[PDB]
Design a protein around this ligand. Structure first.
Ligand SMILES: [Ca+2]
Ligand SMILES: [Ca+2]
Ligand SMILES: [Ca+2]
Ligand SMILES: [Ca+2]
Ligand SMILES: [Cu+2]
Ligand SMILES: [Cu+2]
Ligand SMILES: [Xe]
Ligand SMILES: [Xe]
Ligand SMILES: [Xe]
Ligand SMILES: [Xe]
Ligand SMILES: [Xe]
Ligand SMILES: [Xe]
Ligand SMILES: [Xe]
Ligand SMILES: [Xe]
Ligand SMILES: [Xe]
Ligand SMILES: [Xe]
Ligand SMILES: [Xe]
Lengths: 718, 720
């Protein structure tokens, strides 16, 4: 016998007591439990359950059998989770597979002693075999393989290991590649600064008595063809710094015009750049509420007391007509795979793999601490790795189910991220409605299934939602919050003398604090397979045309329709007044229209939209990262083309991403296509965003276009 | 005593859940969340105990209640959602009494004829300054309540004004050259005229229809075409499109193509029958109501607020967190949000004097005889408030909504209570903000939004408007479209038929013999924003890429070109979603010295392709008559009489009497009382997914505080 409230809260359930009904309600993930003290039975998700030991009330305190949690929550009356008897071949590496793969490479003599890992991931078996698993249950007959990418000092090495046979299949050094930043690089950088008298010197000049209070933040340095005076072949990071004044918000206290360049192979500062002294803003600016009181609000709950409409079977999700596989990657986070829509009995392919491709937050300011600053969060830091556990009921609604996921850390040890992903169903207005005059109304509710993931790199938090609509639409939303990267300036108000120079590149958002203008650019890789792999890309441009049919109208609304046959043409800006379809030319609906999906890389946003990259074309960043300046890309499927910024974007000299994948301008005619959507905002700051930035959203959409023969949510014919 | 619980409460509109295990009823309606056990002498209402005289009785597991149960429980007073109003707000709509009174005053005139009908009976609003002083300083309003009474005398419009405090007719003005809107009885008239026409019965026989009594008409306005339509300019005319009733409940799926009757309403006669080639009527049953579908098994989801709401509704005034505002209903534009303030640390700061739909238009792109003139001015021509669709509880709005009744005059001048006219609900909208600093505890708060939702159906589209108050000061306006598509009857069954290419020049083939004609939805919103005061300026901020003149390796920088927009003609513009447009207050600054502003975003996204302007050539009449369609943003000088982007009398208008007119003098917009108009819409190209019934599509607009506050507005009360 064990104390109920304490044990249940330790287990993650919410416990509610209703004194009028004398009834506990226990909620956790898919389980909604009702139990009265002294009763011999309980209710799990609407279903009766016999108890071995009743709940006993001793002294206004609930006690339960030590076995109650297993008997009630793992009873099988919660159907949310089902056992996976046959593993999906895209399942992520398990903890054991991660450990096995590390032993296999550590067994090589070429494995040097301080070697770190940038990625340990499933090597994807071939597409055709994976589709036949999902659609025909045909076993895949390859062994499980892992990509093991190692960073030996500054050297990158790619290995492949076979996990069934426990052998090493290849070992390829990659000359010229720089590695991504690893967690331990953060501490190194912070120690190197703590141990430089030269740095302490530099900081003393800037008014800082105590150099031990200085917080560093490490940045990749980009590539500028020697013009930043940094040699190409060293492992370098740039270091910006802030003053810890004890408000929990080092970000609010920048030490402007002071940059250290750190060589991580020498573990020393190798350059200090110093510009005008700007006094460090010092006023406490906490964002955690330590100085605040919230208003009392009344409680709101979203409850599903008979359980969920979805089923999670291992990593497979089933919900209404949708089925898909959800797996987690250390670089790009969640990946949605083998997505199909069940059209009256038949599973129809929609998307083979979908995931974040990459993202970049480049800044607009040419000064010493800014000019090179461009966060490539997934590429350079690893957004999977930096997943933020979801705060139950706040980051996601209280009817969510939260999943743990596992990936390798930089030392090769499996790391379990709790609450890495949230899945929840939500009400989203009426699905359709018609109220014919003087007739009974027709309305049905809209339901969306959301898959939500959060990653935090330095000062922003990014939120990605993959949204499945019952009617076949799929949305992808990207939200941004966190703390602005700010410049320390002399101006306190717009009336000060330096105000105008001070704000040339950003808004004054606090006294001495300027929010530097920048962009948020997200790129999604969507290997759509519209009812099969063989697809084509169709444009439909609504046009105003002279009326030629007679009568009083001078004009008409027509559609200009044409195919886009190759990769260079498919790389384009997106006009939200046009329609872009990925069609299957081999298959038609009942009316003879090619089954298609409409691609909408900009379906809206709460911040101003990027039309492309806010950079002149002669900028190195513009040259290295082509993906930034078009909204839409379509390339021929290739298992190894995965990242719009290239595989090794750190200090890269040219575009190894989407600029390379499209170089040879290949045919896109009736073939396996991969769609990439680039969507962006231009962020000009305002005081409302300081000291913490209310979440801002961009939206994208994939809508079925004559994929069905009729309203998909009408339901099956009697 | 007794009366049967389940039946009484469901009649009453409450949701009823019985929990067999807990032996407990949970009854839910609007702001009341009630728990009651059979036999208990008490019940719980929003967390408070309440004594019952008669307990809920169980007999053979039928539940029984006292015939006074409903008033005792739902009228207890433990539901605090609704409070009675202390001093009537000067913007409260006409009451049923006031409507009846206003009608008696004009009926007591010698000039009143018994055929006269009413297009509008509305509060004539007192002046803006006195209304603000009432809201902000509690100063009573000393002008008397007046009503606008707008009458249609056969084809003539008369505008009467009546004083209700003093019971008299202050004025009576015929308005020459104005046509009146379509009225509800016009629907019946047009259907009877067609049923009485032997010539129409013949036209319909030609096209396969042997039974003329199974034909359904629908009235359209005719527009203006400089005579090319062959129609008398002065007469009261409407065009009639026709459909075959086949008994599937969806006559919209069965057009009788190329048949138009023109009807003179005065004369009660068909004046002209335009015929073109014969196209066989599509006959296959296509019900949208599920008579032929399997109901899918879905598990329940409830959004519950078991201690009541965070908002209070005091008369028509709504209070929620830091917002206060006033809500009323107009027969032409529906809901109006007024005297909107944000409470900043004890000081109520002005945001918006009046906000409402201005007008809307759905113009088609097909030049054939049943199409070429077709453009629904849904509010202006039909009265969207009049056509309000009662919210379907749990479906049209979430299960935690409160549903308000509204009263407007009908066309004969009798008050009409519309049930469930507006839904108010609070909703979760993700994290308000979050930061997870590496190795520290998390910070996250939930975002909450308050939605005011109204739905209106005109013919075949159902429209859903949401006004959304974010806790942090943002205001969103979303427009949703659903219903049944206007379809053309055609000969092609599939795209393989010989006529397919021509049949689909103006629309997609969405069913056998059925084309969804391409069109646009264009919405316009009139927002009298008063950003912390009436005296505002318009500012542009265009992000630009400039050469780096500061040295270092960069070739370019990100900067902003800032300028004022000094006059109306300059303020009428396309919106580029990559730029920023602010209504500032040049007289008031935040702690940083920045003028307190709102950012106006007329296009914040949409589910359909976006309309860049009117999809018409510059020489179309519809184009000439309706300037509002081609610009996303207009700013004009406050004028109490300028309310409709399409003009006050848009039926068969020959020129622009709306935003084209309101801006034609190109007046100054420098530090003055400005009114913002947002035009936004979609180009609709149909697809099979939208037939027989169209899944709801949404467009979004946003108003965001810009340096209006000093910091993150949602941080919480400062303890330090
Ligand atoms: Ca290629
Ligand atoms: Ca593909
Ligand atoms: Ca104003
Ligand atoms: Ca004017
Ligand atoms: Cu930003
Ligand atoms: Cu439409
Ligand atoms: Xe990292
Ligand atoms: Xe799956
Ligand atoms: Xe997350
Ligand atoms: Xe970072
Ligand atoms: Xe168009
Ligand atoms: Xe494209
Ligand atoms: Xe596409
Ligand atoms: Xe009407
Ligand atoms: Xe108000
Ligand atoms: Xe209509
Ligand atoms: Xe504007």
């Amino acid at each position: 016998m064990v104390p109920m409230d304490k044990t249940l809260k330790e287990f993650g359930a919410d416990v509610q007591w209703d004194d009028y009904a004398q009834l506990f309600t226990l909620i956790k993930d898919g389980a909604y439990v009702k139990v009265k003290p002294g009763a011999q039975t309980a209710i799990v998700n609407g279903q009766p359950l016999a108890l071995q030991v009743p709940v006993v009330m001793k002294d206004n305190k609930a006690w339960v059998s030590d076995t109650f949690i297993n008997d009630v929550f793992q009873s099988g009356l919660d159907q949310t989770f089902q056992v996976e008897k046959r593993p999906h071949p895209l399942n992520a590496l398990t903890a054991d597979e991660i450990k096995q793969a590390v032993e296999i490479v550590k067994a090589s003599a070429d494995f040097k002693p301080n070697t770190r890992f940038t990625e340990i991931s499933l090597l994807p078996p071939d597409k055709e075999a994976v589709w036949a698993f999902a659609l025909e249950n045909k076993p895949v007959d390859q062994p499980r393989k892992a990509d093991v990418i190692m960073l030996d000092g500054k050297h990158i090495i790619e290995a492949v290991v076979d996990l069934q046979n426990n052998k090493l299949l290849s070992w390829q050094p990659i000359k010229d590649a720089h590695g991504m930043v690893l967690l331990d690089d953060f501490a190194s950088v912070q120690n190197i600064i703590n141990n430089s008298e030269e740095f302490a010197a530099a900081v003393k000049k800037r008014g800082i008595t105590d150099a031990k209070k200085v917080i560093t933040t490490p940045l990749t340095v980009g590539y500028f063809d020697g013009k930043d005076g940094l040699k190409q072949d060293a492992r370098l990071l740039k270091v910006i710094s802030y003053l810890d004044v004890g408000d929990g918000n080092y970000w609010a206290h920048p030490i402007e015009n002071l940059v250290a360049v750190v060589d991580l192979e020498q573990k020393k500062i190798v350059k200090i750049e110093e510009g005008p002294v700007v006094p460090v803003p010092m006023t406490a600016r906490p964002f955690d509420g330590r100085d605040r009181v919230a208003p009392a609000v009344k409680p709101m709950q979203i409850i599903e007391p008979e359980g969920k409409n979805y089923t999670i079977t291992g990593d497979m999700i089933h919900w209404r007509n949708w089925d898909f596989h959800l797996s987690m990657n250390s670089r790009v986070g969640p990946m949605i795979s083998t997505v199909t829509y069940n059209d009256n009995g038949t599973k129809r392919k929609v998307m083979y793999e979908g995931s974040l491709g990459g993202m970049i937050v480049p800044y607009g300011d040419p000064d010493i601490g800014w000019y090179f600053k461009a966060y490539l969060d997934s590429g350079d830091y690893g957004m999977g790795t930096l997943t933020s556990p979801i705060a139950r009921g706040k980051d996601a609604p209280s009817n969510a189910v939260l999943l743990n996921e596992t990936i390798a850390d930089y030392t090769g040890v499996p790391m379990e991220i709790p609450r890495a992903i949230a899945v929840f169903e939500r009400y989203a207005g009426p699905e359709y409605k018609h109220q014919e005059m003087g007739q009974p109304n027709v309305s049905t509710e809209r339901r969306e299934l959301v898959v939500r993931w959060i990653s935090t790199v330095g000062n922003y938090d990014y939120i990605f939602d993959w949204i499945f609509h019952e009617n076949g639409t799929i949305g992808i939303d990207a939200g941004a919050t966190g703390i602005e990267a700010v410049k320390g300036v002399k101006a306190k108000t717009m009336h000060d003398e330096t105000a105008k120079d001070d704000t040339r590149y950003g808004t004054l958002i606090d006294h001495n604090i300027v929010g530097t203008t920048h962009q948020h650019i997200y790129n999604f890789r969507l290997d759509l397979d519209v009812d099969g792999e063989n697809n084509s890309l169709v444009a439909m441009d609504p046009v105003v045309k002279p009326n030629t049919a007679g009568g009083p109208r001078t004009s008409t609304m027509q559609v200009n329709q044409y195919n886009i046959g190759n990769e260079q043409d498919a790389a384009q800006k997106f006009d939200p007044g046009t329609i872009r379809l990925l069609s299957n030319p081999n298959k038609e609906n009942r009316m003879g229209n090619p089954v298609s999906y409409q691609i909408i890389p900009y379906a809206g946003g709460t911040h101003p939209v990027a039309k492309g990259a806010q950079f002149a074309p002669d900028e190195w960043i513009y040259h290295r990262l082509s993906f930034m300046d078009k909204q839409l890309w379509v390339t021929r499927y290739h298992p190894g083309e995965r990242f719009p910024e290239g595989k090794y974007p750190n200090r890269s000299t040219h575009d190894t991403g989407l600029g390379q994948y499209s170089k040879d301008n290949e045919s896109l005619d009736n073939t396996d296509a991969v769609v990439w959507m680039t969507t962006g905002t231009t962020h000009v700051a305002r005081a409302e965003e300081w000291p913490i930035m209310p979440t801002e959203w961009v939206h994208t959409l994939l809508k079925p276009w004559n994929f069905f023969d009729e309203t998909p949510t009408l339901g099956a014919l009697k």
